[PDB]
Design a protein around this nucleic acid. Structure first.
Ligand SMILES: [Mg+2]
Ligand SMILES: [Mg+2]
Ligand SMILES: [Mg+2]
Ligand SMILES: [Mg+2]
Ligand SMILES: [Mg+2]
Ligand SMILES: [Mg+2]
Ligand SMILES: [Mg+2]
Ligand SMILES: [Mg+2]
Ligand SMILES: [Mg+2]
Ligand SMILES: [Mg+2]
Ligand SMILES: [Mg+2]
Ligand SMILES: [Mg+2]
Ligand SMILES: [Mg+2]
Ligand SMILES: [Mg+2]
Ligand SMILES: [Mg+2]
Ligand SMILES: [Mg+2]
Ligand SMILES: [Mg+2]
Ligand SMILES: [Mg+2]
Lengths: 205, 156, 50, 164, 273
RNA sequence: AUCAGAGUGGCGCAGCGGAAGCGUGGUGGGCCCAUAACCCACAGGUCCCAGGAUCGAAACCUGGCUCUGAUACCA
RNA sequence: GGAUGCGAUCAUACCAGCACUAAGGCAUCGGAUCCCGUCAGAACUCCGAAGUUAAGCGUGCUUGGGCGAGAGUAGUACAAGGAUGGGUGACCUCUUGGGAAGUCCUCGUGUUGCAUUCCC
RNA sequence: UCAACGAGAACAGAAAUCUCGUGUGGAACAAAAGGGUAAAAGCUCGUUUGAUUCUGAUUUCCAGUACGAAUACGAACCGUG
RNA sequence: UAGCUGGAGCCCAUUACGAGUUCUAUCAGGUAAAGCCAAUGAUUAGAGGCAUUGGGGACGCAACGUCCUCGACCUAUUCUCAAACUUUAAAUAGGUAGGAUGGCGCGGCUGCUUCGGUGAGCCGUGCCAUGGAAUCGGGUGCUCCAAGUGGGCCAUUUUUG
């Protein structure tokens, strides 16, 4: 089957994506990235926990699928399947090659599999949930850590949900009526646009 | 030949700049060149006649000849342990006047004036530029002083 | 047996042994290759100088 | 506002007859269209070679003519008498103009001067106001201002309020 | 109605192209001097027609913009006698003839190059007198179609008979026979003296009592019968040769008044229900 | 392991861009007491799949899938 | 404050929606004998002044799109040189120097040459 | 002025032909790829043979040799307008 | 064969002429980074709208009507990317200039150029020009004759399989 992953751990080549040049690639192991509930709104799940890469390396598509399931199955059992939203933050866009009497004559490898190029301080997995269920968040990612090769940390987000606002700033801007919801995202309102496009409680300066 | 064409590797070098394609402004055609001026070569993608080879792009030479529609430019090219002074003709669209001695002429005429001017007075001065040297002493008025200190490390 | 080899190693050292020579700057530069119409006239002007 | 330069007027009437053949069928469609127009028609060669209609590329299949002047007004209202001077109200383009179709002989002009059949035809007429030249002249082309354009609503009224 | 990406990638054309008044392919090829002449300007003999006037100019190219050597108009013909028909073929000959004479007087050579005094239908070229060749200009026709009988070629003949050297061929003069490949000097001369208008004056007043009234009202107003073309134009020609020579728009609002009005619109909308 | 070949009617096969057939088999009448044989008609096609160029493709290049022959030596 | 002919720069000049304009100029506009031109006097060409500022044009407006600039991003990313520097390594650090880019925010929306002409 | 899109017209539809609007090229330019081009370098029409003669110079290759190819003049004869 | 080397010289020389270097001024670039909420391409998820009918069920005694359903499609967002993508855009490195081989006046030449002393250039004369940034220093400057070599290998950095 696959080689031991150590053959492909270190980032050593320029990116080699599938293209009109690279074809005949296999299909990646991971094909679903947001599992659990991706229908809840911004204001519901405010606490967020991340699993962050801490050394530059490749992460295979299989390893990234295995981590998804390990995190999913755990977080389901304790807090219920509707208590969390798991999002994979890395996509396997890099192709790997394999060179299978004949020696190093014409040694350019044919494609093997797919992997993701990760760097220091880069998020691998993110989970948003209620503050109460944060424990099953902490352990689910840690249980997922053992599916990844390198070094990873579990850093709790200073922001709200999966949005770019501090919990401090989002609440202030929510109570002031300056943030309109979107879904998983929030949309702060500014001082620009045509005046008539605003609803009469939403025009601000 | 011999492994590479005339316009090999000129994908980015010969392209026009972004939103600056199409029409060539009339200023390029109105500039007049004289044997001895300095000219900077930069190719125009649109004009496929009179083009210089890609080595001459971004180089500054002297005018040595003028025909209709073309200027003879004079670029040095290092080949081994020597410098060959290559002589090429490029169409006007591919050259622009240089400002490599803009300053020299303004300083030259400035030099002559002061030289004759101080000669009306006692006739010894030195019109030489000087590299920036060290600052003399001076007193600073006591005002608001803001302390700065190292910041404690924030984990995020 | 692998008989193709290329490198620029040592070549800048060889180039700079006897300097990167520049050609001598000359008063009365050469007119070879200029516009023949211009050059005939310059020759004729000099023929009839007093 | 009711400025007199704004009076709506037909710039052209175009008659189209599509056949899908050549030789004599389309040639006789030319004569009915010529004798209806009073001017030498033009043929329209095909494109894309759609074999379901049996047409090749660059082979003439249609015949149209673009009349304007008093021949247009005389010829237009005869077409509208055939339609009993009413239209489907979906017949009006969003921009400014409208069309309809008939079965030939119900106009005025004898049938078998050449022994030529009943060619149905496309009457398509385009309205304008004064000053549409500014988008059609060669020097200083420009968009006709919005207020000088004819909308579907103005064509609706032009049809009903007068002209009949 | 156009997307944001459309505007970001958009390139505008040269202004005189957007406004649709200059053909830059012709402009480059008209103005572009050979580099081994160094400043010798290429003078353009610009001839333009409005619906109601005729503009003529001798100009040459500069980086700051063109520079007029001499300008003339047909609305200043009433000075020399012609009152009506200031945009027709004959007027163009008068406007062209006027421009030639002014610049030749302005360049101090009109004595040397008189042109020819009696306008002839023949294609004319002035001789290289001696030591001072005649002034040279290029006909710059603009955007109009160059057609046989076009008035711009009426203007061309006037300048040639004024004493200018303009590169030309006779195939577009009025009277040229596209099927016989020869010039008809008689038809050309009739057009020069406005006789082609005269024929249409006769043709209406006979078979059209009212079309002759409305269609030539200013001619009739001033007492110029169709049999008074050759006489009347010749005088205008000889005359020209003998003497060639507050707030209503709103101002932009300041910063304060835009911010003033914007506060109102904001207060109005927020308070609007 | 690479590479040549070949995928078309139920089956075996032909098809040189305007472009679908040969044998046999199927279906309905006839002949016979009745079957075959014989006679008269009738109906058949994801042209292996996905592209791409092409007046215009089942045919021409590219990729994918399946059957067959091949060459793989000195140690 | 306007305009035309020819232009320079070639978006602060473009795009979208709107609103308005004294004079003069442009334009729209009337016609088809003539030159010319087309299926078609729509275009183009020619002759014309009966009307209209409706359009073109010009100028202004918009918490407009774009474009331009500024501050920030950020001494961050990166990167020249040095270390018998740390670390198993990936990588990172210090020393001597250089130093970006989007989001986000604030402001702005042309300048002008030659010739002839209009104001009032 | 293209690709394409919107709105319309007997048979007529997803698709035949016609009409108006939008249209920075999203089309086309013999062929690979890249670059280039919008009153063009694309399309249609007219007229044509500069795909001509003479020998030098220069650029790419490079030893600063030859060939191939290209460029800018000189001296002619023509095309087009 | 060119490069690198020796030998022979010769010609000038602290006037100047330079330089594997900086400073001043001025050109050129598309790699690192960045971007995608900018074109091309790849790619995750929702949210809001909506059709001239991609499809139907139900209501349509009808339709130039809809509620759902997978969804196109439209708008504002969102995760993640690119050796053979890119608006932007470094650090290092690249080119040119920093006078005596400069400037001016006068009067001549031209068969080139101009409407034209109009220019372009050159010639002769006569005047000026505190030497026009720092640092360092005699020169392959010129020429000839010729040897050996044309298997390389190693280290830090960038980098392909
Ligand atoms: Mg090579
Ligand atoms: Mg060879
Ligand atoms: Mg070889
Ligand atoms: Mg470039
Ligand atoms: Mg060529
Ligand atoms: Mg070797
Ligand atoms: Mg032209
Ligand atoms: Mg049977
Ligand atoms: Mg039987
Ligand atoms: Mg053309
Ligand atoms: Mg060669
Ligand atoms: Mg040797
Ligand atoms: Mg590159
Ligand atoms: Mg990169
Ligand atoms: Mg960027
Ligand atoms: Mg993108
Ligand atoms: Mg530099
Ligand atoms: Mg040897």
């Amino acid at each position: 089957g696959r080689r031991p992953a150590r053959c492909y751990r270190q980032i050593k080549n320029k990116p080699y994506p599938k293209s009109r040049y690279c074809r005949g690639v296999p299909d990646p192991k991971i094909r679903i990235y947001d599992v659990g509930m991706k229908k809840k709104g911004v204001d519901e799940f405010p606490s967020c926990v991340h699993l962050v890469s801490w050394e530059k390396e490749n992460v295979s598509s299989e390893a990234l699928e295995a981590a998804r399931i390990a995190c999913n199955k755990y977080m389901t059992k304790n807090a219920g399947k509707d208590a969390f939203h798991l999002r994979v933050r890395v996509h396997p866009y890099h192709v790997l090659r394999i060179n299978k009497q004949t020696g190093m004559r014409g040694a350019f490898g044919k494609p093997l599999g797919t992997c993701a190029r990760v760097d220091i301080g880069q998020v691998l997995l993110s989970v948003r949930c209620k503050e109460s269920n944060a424990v099953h968040a902490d352990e689910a990612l840690r249980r997922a850590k053992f599916k990844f090769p390198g070094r990873q940390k579990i850093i709790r987000s200073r922001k709200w949900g999966f949005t770019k606002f501090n919990r401090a700033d989002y609440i202030k801007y929510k109570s002031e009526g300056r943030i309109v919801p979107d879904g998983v995202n929030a949309k702060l309102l500014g001082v620009h646009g045509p005046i008539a496009k605003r609803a009469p409680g939403q025009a601000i300066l | 030949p011999a492994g590479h064409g005339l316009r090999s590797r000129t994908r980015d070098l010969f392209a026009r700049p972004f939103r600056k394609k199409g029409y060539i402004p009339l200023t390029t055609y109105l500039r007049t060149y004289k044997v001895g001026e300095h000219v900077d070569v930069k190719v125009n993608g649109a004009v496929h006649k009179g083009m210089p080879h890609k080595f001459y792009h971004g180089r500054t030479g002297r005018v040595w000849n003028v025909t209709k529609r073309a200027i003879g430019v004079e670029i040095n090219k290092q080949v081994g342990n020597r410098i060959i002074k290559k002589r090429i003709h490029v169409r006007v669209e591919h050259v622009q006047p240089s400002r490599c001695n803009e300053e020299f002429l303004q300083r030259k005429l400035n030099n002559d004036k002061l030289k004759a001017e101080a000669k009306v007075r006692g006739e010894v001065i030195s019109t030489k530029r000087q590299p920036a040297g060290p600052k003399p002493g001076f007193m600073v008025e006591g005002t608001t002083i803001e302390t700065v200190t190292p910041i404690p490390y924030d984990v995020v | 047996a692998k008989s193709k080899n290329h490198t620029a190693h040592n070549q800048s050292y060889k180039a700079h042994r006897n300097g990167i020579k520049k050609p001598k700057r000359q008063r009365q530069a050469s007119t070879k290759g200029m516009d023949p119409k211009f050059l005939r006239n310059l020759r004729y002007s000099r023929k009839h100088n007093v | 506002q009711l400025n007199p330069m704004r009076e709506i007027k037909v710039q052209k009437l175009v008659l189209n007859i599509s056949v899908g053949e050549s030789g004599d069928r389309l040639t006789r469609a030319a004569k009915v269209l010529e004798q209806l127009s009073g001017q030498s028609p033009v043929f329209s060669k095909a494109r894309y070679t759609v074999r379901s209609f049996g047409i090749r590329r660059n082979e003439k299949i249609a015949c149209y003519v673009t009349i304007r002047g008093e021949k247009a007004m005389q010829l237009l209202e005869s077409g509208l008498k055939v339609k009993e001077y009413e239209l489907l109200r979906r017949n009006f383009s969003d921009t400014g103009c409208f069309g309809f179709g008939i079965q030939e002989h119900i106009d005025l002009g004898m049938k078998y001067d050449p022994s030529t059949g009943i060619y149905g035809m496309d009457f398509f007429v385009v309205l304008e106001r004064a000053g549409y030249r500014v988008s059609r002249r060669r020097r200083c082309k420009a968009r006709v201002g919005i207020h000088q354009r004819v909308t579907k609503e103005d064509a609706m009224k032009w049809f009903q309020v007068k002209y009949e | 109605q156009k997307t944001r990406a459309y505007s970001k990638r958009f390139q505008v054309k040269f202004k005189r192209r957007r406004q649709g008044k200059t053909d830059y392919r012709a402009r480059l090829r008209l103005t572009n001097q050979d580099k081994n002449k160094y400043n010798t300007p290429k003078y353009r003999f610009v001839v333009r027609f409005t619906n109601k006037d005729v503009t003529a100019q001798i100009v040459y190219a500069t980086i700051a913009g063109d520079i007029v050597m001499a300008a003339a108009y047909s609305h200043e013909l009433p000075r020399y006698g012609l009152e009506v028909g200031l945009t027709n073929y004959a007027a163009a000959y008068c406007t062209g003839l006027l421009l030639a004479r002014r610049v030749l007087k302005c360049r101090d050579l009109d004595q040397e190059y008189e042109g020819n005094v009696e306008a002839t239908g023949e294609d004319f070229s002035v001789e290289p007198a001696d030591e001072r060749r005649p002034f040279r200009a290029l006909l710059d026709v603009g955007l109009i179609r160059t057609t046989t009988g076009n008035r711009v070629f009426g203007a061309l003949k006037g300048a040639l008979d004024g004493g200018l050297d303009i590169p030309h061929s006779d195939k577009r003069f009025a009277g040229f026979k596209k099927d016989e490949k020869q010039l008809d000097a008689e038809i050309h001369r009739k057009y020069i003296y406005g006789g082609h208008v005269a024929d249409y004056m006769k043709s209406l007043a006979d078979e059209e009592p009212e079309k002759y009234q409305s269609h030539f009202s200013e001619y009739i107003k001033k007492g110029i019968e169709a049999d008074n073309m050759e006489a009347l134009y010749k005088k205008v020609h000889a005359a020209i040769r003998a003497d060639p020579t507050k707030r209503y728009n709103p101002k932009k609002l300041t910063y304060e008044q835009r911010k003033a009005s914007l506060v109102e619109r904001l207060n109005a909308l927020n308070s609007s229900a």
